[PDB]
Paper text:
MukBEF folds the chromosome of Escherichia coli and related bacteria. The SMC protein MukB dimerizes at its ‘‘hinge’’ domain, which connects via the long coiled-coil ‘‘arm’’ to the ABC-type ATPase ‘‘head’’ domain. The heads are bridged by the kleisin MukF, whereby the C-terminal winged-helix domain (cWHD) of MukF binds the ‘‘cap’’ surface of one MukB, and the N-terminal middle domain (MD) binds the coiled-coil ‘‘neck’’ of the other MukB. MukF also recruits the dimeric KITE protein MukE.
Using cryoelectron microscopy (cryo-EM), we demonstrate that ATP binding opens one of MukBEF’s three potential DNA entry gates, exposing a DNA capture site that positions DNA at the open neck gate. All three conditions enabled the reconstruction of a state with engaged heads, and we pooled the datasets to increase the signal and obtain higher resolution (STAR Methods). The resolved state was free of DNA, and the neck gate had opened widely. The neck and head regions of MukB adopted radically different conformations from what we had previously observed for the apo and DNA-bound unloading states of MukBEF. ATP binding and head engagement had triggered the detachment of the MukF MD from the MukB neck, which resulted in a swing-out of the MD of about 180°. Detachment of the MD was facilitated by the mechanical distortion of the MukB neck constrained between engaged heads and aligned arms, while the MD swing-out was stabilized by the binding of MukE to the top surface of the heads. This surface is formed by the engagement of the heads upon ATP binding and is a highly conserved DNA-binding site in all SMC complexes. Our structure reveals that occupation of the top of the heads by MukE and DNA is mutually exclusive, suggesting that MukE senses the DNA-free state of the heads to open the neck gate. Our findings show that MukBEF employs a dedicated mechanism for opening its neck gate, converting the DNA-free apo form to the open-gate state: (1) ATP binds the heads and leads to their engagement, (2) the neck distorts and releases the MD of MukF, (3) MukE binds the DNA-free top of the heads and stabilizes the open-gate state. This mechanism ensures that the gate opens only when the heads are DNA-free, which serves as an indicator that the complex is ready for loading.
Residue numbers in the entry:
A (entry chain E): 81 to 213
B (entry chain D): 1 to 290
C (entry chain C): 1 to 147
D (entry chain C): 246 to 294
Write the structure that this text describes.
Amino acid sequence: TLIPRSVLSELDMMVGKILCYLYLSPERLANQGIFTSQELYEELISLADEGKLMKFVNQRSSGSDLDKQKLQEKVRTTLNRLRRLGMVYFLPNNNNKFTITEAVFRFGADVRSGDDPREIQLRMIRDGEAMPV
Amino acid sequence: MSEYSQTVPELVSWARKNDFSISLPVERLAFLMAIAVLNSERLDGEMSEGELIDAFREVCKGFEQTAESVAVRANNAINDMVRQKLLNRFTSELADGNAIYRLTPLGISISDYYIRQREFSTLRLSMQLSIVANELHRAAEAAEEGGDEFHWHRNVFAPLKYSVAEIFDSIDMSQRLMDEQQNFVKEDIAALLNQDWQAAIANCEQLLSETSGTLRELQDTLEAAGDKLQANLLRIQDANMGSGGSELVDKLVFDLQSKLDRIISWGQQAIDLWIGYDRHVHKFIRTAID
Amino acid sequence: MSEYSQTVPELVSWARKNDFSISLPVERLAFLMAIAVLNSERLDGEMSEGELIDAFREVCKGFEQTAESVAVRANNAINDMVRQKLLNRFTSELADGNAIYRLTPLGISISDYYIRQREFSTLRLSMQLSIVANELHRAAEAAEEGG
Amino acid sequence: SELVDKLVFDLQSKLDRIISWGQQAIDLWIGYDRHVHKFIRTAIDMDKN
């Protein structure tokens, strides 16, 4: 390439795959696409390993509220980066609420076909879609 | 089935697999004690994260430590206490993410050992012996009245297991406290003899006589009550043997008899050890005077 | 008199002055629990130094540690447990120079918390409430009788 | 007797704490129970294909 290429962080992926599940969820379709940072955070902690994920915020985290607020602020920051990428749009007057777009489906590129995960991953790296860490 | 179902090798393997460890340096121990005191002054037995941080700040101030990173240090200390099983943390969605803290049975036992001024009381022992004598008498009467497995489980096994066994454990703990008090008197006698031995002879003789008198009063109280307690345990054993014989009641009565024999034997052994030390101190005083 | 006669600053100053500390790594904690199990199987509630060294040898085997210097390590562990107020050491001339060891209330509380399988029992609670109700009722009758 | 009054007050305070703890534990357990049931229902029933 004549133009530089870069990769997203693993926290960005966690927020990306969660935003993807949120888009699909018919249970929340009644919101008309408007979600709140707190709802996103609540869904994320419901699915992923909370205490093990906390390791990325700080190597000494053990469930303290200061560390929980630090995690929430990192989420707030990464979500803002995804907005610049065009993956989510904030409301015109309220920044605690936002709307999703279909571009988030790229986070599901590792599972859209019901096949061997290793082979899928190999195919993706071969196509230049994704790198390991 | 032995209260401790695990052999020493099974227990050591279990402890190693679970990675259990306790590391409470002076600052961490002071913080645990401050938390225990703050919890005792409250109406709900619950502490918030901010209140724990304020308590840690007071400990850091008492240790004249730098006010830098105190919030981080307090979080590390709180996480360490939770990680060492001294505090239980409750994270409720209803509490908007605010965690509620309560001390564990372990954290309370360690903090109470240092903060609770436990003195051996002949009155406490006499009361505990009076309650257990009444409980054993009621269990013996119920055992002699006879009945079904439900009568024996509710009126004989439950009182022996959940009341008599706990009071015997409390008496044993009081005896262990007396063991510590004797070691404290020994340190005081060694200190009085190291400062001014000539002026300390009268004080040492008084401490030796008073400790001997207390041990004798305790042993006399235990011997006087011990026979009545052993008679009631034998009444229950005879009644159990006559009404088929629950192996669970027999094992429990045997454990209680063994604990009672240990409680009675401890008093005689403590008196013998104290007599040996008394003779040693008098020999030392005679050698120093000569 | 509040069971805890000292304010937090007084307690902190008192703790700092007496230099109280507990250091129980996994091996020392396992040694304490081993001593508690061995003591509960005995008729005299007393342990000799040789029995403590053997108990420590059994723990060292469980930690897959070398049998070299086990006696020195055992003596250091025993001295450390005595220094941390987990074991009371009695040296009687009558015991032919042999030291007797007994677990302290602290050593028993710590060992029981991990080894005693304490499960909540509704029957236990109902019994405890029955005893306290009778004790409070007698105390109330005695208070009303006056004296 | 100031000693008996203080002791009775302490025991009453302990009894209130003992009674209050049970209701609080039930509320915390209910919050979790509702959350796990909601999660299971969302996981099971809302994906239909």
